[model samples]
Target chain A: TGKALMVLGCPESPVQIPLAIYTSHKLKKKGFRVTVTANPAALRLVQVADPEGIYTDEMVDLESCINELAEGDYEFLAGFVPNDAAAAYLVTFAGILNTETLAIIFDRDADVLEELVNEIMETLDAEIIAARAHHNPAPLRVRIDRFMEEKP
Target chain B: TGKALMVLGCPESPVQIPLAIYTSHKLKKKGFRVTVTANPAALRLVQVADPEGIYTDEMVDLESCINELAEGDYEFLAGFVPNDAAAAYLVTFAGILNTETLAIIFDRDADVLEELVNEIMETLDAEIIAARAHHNPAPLRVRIDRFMEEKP
Candidate 1:
């Protein structure tokens, strides 16, 4: 499996949407390669961007989308999936949000925004029944695939 | 500053919109003293069923709004604030999220929610910058009056 993770949280803010738009537009604006992957459930949300084409088979898995020996070079990857998958990948990529990370996030003056992050994290951390069972929490990247396989 | 700490989290969903509306409704369904704290920056958020009342100065901190001192009566102590302040309180409240004394939230759908939660956690955890001497980050929470009093 490939070992690259992207995006920290789900599309929680309008800032994320614009960041995403800018990401794609910048790449397309520069004529670079881009790989966009989205889940089947988010078809409605995905349909709006007018994707040049949708991914099939293996590309559905982000690691597969990234590490394949043969494929087009992508400049950006964007789309939404059920929140669970996103949270898994996010945790796998970076573990948990420590105080240092929190410090940076609060620089902006939006309480609801901060609360939103906490809410999502609390749900993600609490939902994992096995989290406490293990001696050490799985690495952020491992959590993504492992949690995906858990079927939960 | 307070010995009794309260922390809460939700999906990294939007505010004043689907996620925000949905979260508030769910919290109220279970019964909690929910208050919407506002600052000039994020006042537009935190839509309340009751809107035209006067929200006083002390309410700025949000402890009273959520009913923190009601003798085991506080449910969620939630509301919006400037994004920055909200974030600080959240990260700092990590310990509070773990406390068994107060379970301020109710959610179900185990096994399927982990993936989404992990992703949300990572996103916030990743959005941080290291502060250097040349560049100083503002305190986690700042008192406007304190700044005014100093008049630097």
Candidate 2:
């Protein structure tokens, strides 16, 4: 009921910023204190996007945060993986948390999206939401809304 | 009957160098042209450890190597993942290769070891051999041997 974490990967994808803000906002309203973990550039984007502390409660460095993050630190964990490096980061965070981790995987290529989903499914025991998205966030929004409905 | 790629992580660990060299050596003897991918620091240790070119057939930077690594590039792929970043790299490579990817995950702590295994298991369809190892490579050897016996 208290702690939740949202992990942000490379902001290279255009849709990541909006998705991060939206997911954070939704998670916050669900009664979980949401914190974001991202690299400096990604963090800057999220901070500037919010600015008023409406969605997020705090921020931490992604790599360093993962190193120091302990099990049971957060009751819920969500990760945004738009590419290979980001996917790796998400996998790592999910592994460390050992909770029911949710991964939002998106890309422009359908093949790459499938590969990402397959990779996550084969390796981890977690929930996954994926779409072929880049500019428009509608595909992602639909999935997110569906996931929230099913979320505990 | 063909080529095998032995992907190395940071090589900052005490056991990674010897393990890489040993793994490469064994794979080569089995009639595979073994290539080692590692960062500068890790590469230096592996090279200096086996100066005669008796164990390693080629060397490449980890990041660059992955970029140019294509499907059907090798018959088998093995990755040494000592931490989260390295594990991420392993997942990306396994996803791209879409082949039998063996992930050698090692850490000094049992908890971290379990987390690494769980993370990789959940994210990618790859074989894993894990150990709580640092300088000594015995634990890794046992699991690697088992994996090789069951390898397809």
Candidate 3:
């Protein structure tokens, strides 16, 4: 089975944590070993959501995970980009891994969505899914469903 | 005269601090008002190098400068990328500014240099100048001279 990395963004976005767990579970169902990475703040949310580690069997700190990615590679990557800084990190990781990347970009602003999409497209080769969802995860979930459908 | 933004990476690289000042001064000569930005450690070096404010008149913290860039746009950008983290920040800045960018990427590792060059090229539309220089600025300086010549 191919290994997949799920990178989470800040906790400000309410949808990212849940979507991450769901995404990781889905990735596993598709026969990919999954690993989730996030900053302390975001990682906490994921931790509380799945305390038993049911969905994500392996969870690592974002900073250390970055170091690991540098020394290794993954088959697939799903970057949960909350803003420009996250987009930067996502692009860097995509470059490091050079894998089949999926940039799940989200912001409440229309311009932010457009800019991140263009930036990711210019900076790396990735299947980008962007939306304007802050509190409600519906918009991004809709896009993700389409993405998951395409893979299998 | 248009405005230009010069972004510096970590203080680990000895050449970065000196090159930032030289690049800023040269940009000013070409009728572009340039502002240098870096993290505290790197910014301290630049401040000490030009204490009398002879070459660099305006300098700002990299974090705060990133915030300012979100509200305003610069005509040109010069990103001094020393590592992968720096590359990520530089590409993010280019995306935020969407201006004529020059990525000055340098490292002692051949693999690092190659990865960064490819990443920057794939992620942004910039005139890239890269070389293998950790302590000696000669290699990067030679490439920079050619870039400056092309501009003028």
Candidate 4:
């Protein structure tokens, strides 16, 4: 199975945790061993949300995850960008990883959505999916499905 | 006269504060209005250290600073990369800004230094200066001086 890294940002919005779980499962179905990277609080949320570890096989600290990653270490990268900081983190991973990168950009405000989308587009070559979502993940899930289809 | 932006990371490292002060002062001497961008904690360290706003004329939150920046907003961009997260922020800024970019990379470990330097080099056209230091900014200062001279 190919290796996939799912990078998570701070647990600011409610949409992230479920989206992360959903994305991890979807990626695993695509034959990628999923390793979720997040800060401490976000990781705890993931643990509580899915105690079985069915979708997320490995959990790593965001900084250490980036530090330990090498070229071709993973075949694909997916990052959660809920804010400007997350956008920076996504672009950083995109720069370092020589693979296909996906950025799931979500926020409650359309302006914030556009701002972060432009920010990521300005610096990163990743496929971007943006939606004004705080408690809903439907829009992002549709995009993720479309993105996963191109994986093979 | 040109404008320069000094983007700082977290102030966990002892050297970043002085380096920010020194670099801002040097850039000011070169006729560039220096705006120091950092997180609140890091900005506080700088304010407490300088007290008079002598070296740092304008200070803004890192994310807000990046958001307000436009292409050619500054003649130069200097990012302090002390860790993996910082490396990403630097690369993200480098990608957004159309001006010249510089990465001041330092760590206690030579290996970490080389890793971040390679990351920035792979993705950015920025000039890189890496050193192994904790409390002493001497090594980085020399490189900064060289970078300043070649700015024209």
The stretch of ten residues in a row with the least summed lDDT in candidate 2 chain B is: B44-53
Better of 1 and 4 by DockQ: 1
Residue A118, candidate 2: alpha-carbon lDDT:
86
Give the DockQ (2 decimals) of all models: 0.04, 0.01, 0.01, 0.01
Off by over 4 Å in 2: B1-152
What are the TM values for chain B, all candidates?
0.32, 0.93, 0.94, 0.95
Candidate 3, B1-152: lDDT as tens digits = 78888988876654566567667767777887888887865665554344345556588997898777762567888999888888898988998988789999988898989999999988989998888875455667667767887672
Of 1 and 4, the candidate ranking higher by TM-score: 4
Q: Clashing residue pairs in candidate 2, if any?
A: A119-B123, A123-B121, A123-B122, A123-B123, A123-B124, A124-B121, A124-B122, A124-B123
Q: Write the per-residue lDDT of candidate 4 for residues B42-92, one digit (tens) a residue.
A: 775565445446666799998897788777778889899988888888777
All candidates: interface RMSD:
17.1, 20.5, 20.6, 18.3
Model 1: fraction of native contacts: 0.09
Badly placed stretches (over 4 Å) of model 3 are A1-152
Docking class of 4: incorrect
Q: Is candidate 3 or candidate 4 better by lDDT?
A: 4
| Fnat of each candidate | 0.09, 0.00, 0.00, 0.00
**Interface quality of candidate 1 as DockQ:** 0.04
